[PDB]
């Protein structure tokens, strides 16, 4: 997705969940790996540390929120678990409630 | 919670079920215990935890 904040739609079909465990996520930067199973690509870039094949990450602080839902009308962190319950925030710029 | 209609998704082996030290044939349990100091066999089995 390119250029500017907020939300645009989808919904996605069909079946299968069970023995599901977390979600884990980080922000990367398009860097060294062109794709696995290839070599000498024009998609190949850089030569420094690869945070995709190393445990290095460094943009894991550039997140404002990460709403996780299901269906299209079910909100998974629902039941008022959190003090902002419809999304998990990660950082809050301008805090007035002391959260 | 867990309710009927969950059997087709189920058939789980080494995701759920009895522990690693009980899956095995009883003779390989004994062999493993005696020799696990020079020759491991503990990581060759996956232990379900539910």
């Amino acid at each position: 997705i390119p250029a500017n904040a907020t939300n645009v739609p989808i919904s996605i079909p069909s079946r299968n969940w069970a023995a599901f465990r977390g979600w884990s996520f980080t922000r990367l930067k398009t860097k060294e790996t062109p794709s696995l199973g290839s070599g000498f690509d024009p998609y190949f870039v850089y030569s420094g540390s690869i945070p995709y094949l190393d445990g290095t990450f460094y943009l894991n602080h550039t997140f404002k929120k990460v709403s996780i839902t299901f269906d299209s009308s079910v909100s998974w962190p629902g039941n008022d678990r959190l003090l902002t319950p419809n999304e998990f925030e990660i950082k809050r710029t301008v805090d007035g409630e002391g959260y | 919670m867990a309710t009927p209609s969950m059997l087709p998704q189920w058939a789980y082996m080494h995701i759920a079920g009895q522990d690693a030290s009980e899956y095995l044939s009883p003779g390989l349990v004994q062999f493993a215990r005696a020799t696990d100091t020079y020759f491991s066999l503990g990581n060759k089995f996956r232990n379900p935890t539910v």
Binding site: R21, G22 | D19, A20, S21, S25, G27, L28, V29, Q30, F31, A32, R33, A34, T35, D36, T37, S40, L41, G42, N43, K44, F45, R46, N47, P48, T49
Partner: peptide, 20 residues
């Protein structure tokens, strides 16, 4: 979270009757 669990099962370092 994370997964991957594995489990392992007098003097003198051995003695056993482990057979088929």
């Amino acid at each position: 979270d994370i997964n991957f669990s594995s489990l392992a099962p007098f003097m003198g370092t051995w003695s056993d009757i482990g057979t088929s």
